[PDB]
């Protein structure tokens, strides 16, 4: 990961994505008290995010793959949360990730975008009520 400017989308810029993932999980360590999953497992997600970029998940187009990455990442968080939400309160635990995510944005772009957080939260809550797991 490198310090790149004009980092509007952290998912289109591989260097920014690396920093986003590492910063997010760094927040997650404090967050970890909300689940048995632990910040430890999230390190794998960092590796996954980096590899997925080079592999080419979503689409070949950098802009499109970036947009797909943020959705996929939110889905990844849901998978983690739904498991843990089976042993606690959904809103409380969802809020914890929101706390980690918000700081991650502030650290990487300098702009706290609640919209993305709400989208992640809505996604988790939606799949929480609906209960659908895609293998």
From TrEMBL:
Keywords linked to the UniProt accession: Signal
Top-rank taxon, per record: Eukaryota
Domain Spidroin N-terminal: 10-133
Membrane spanning stretches: none
UniProt protein name: Flagelliform spidroin variant 1
Gene that encodes the chain: Flag
Covered range of the whole protein: 28 to 154 of 197
């Amino acid at each position: 990961g490198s310090g790149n400017s004009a980092s509007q989308s952290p998912f289109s810029n591989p260097n920014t994505a690396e920093a986003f993932a590492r910063s997010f999980v760094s927040n997650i360590v404090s967050s970890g008290e909300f689940g048995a999953q632990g910040a430890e497992d999230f390190d794998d997600i960092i590796q996954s995010l980096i590899q997925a970029q080079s592999m080419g998940k979503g689409r070949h187009d950098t802009k499109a793959k970036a947009k797909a990455m943020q959705v996929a990442l939110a889905s990844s968080i849901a998978e983690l949360v739904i498991a843990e939400s089976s042993g606690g309160d959904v809103q409380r635990k969802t809020n914890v990730i929101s706390n980690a995510l918000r700081n991650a944005l502030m650290s990487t772009t300098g702009s706290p975008n609640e919209e993305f957080v709400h989208e992640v939260q809505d996604l988790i809550q939606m799949l929480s009520q609906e209960q659908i797991n895609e293998v």
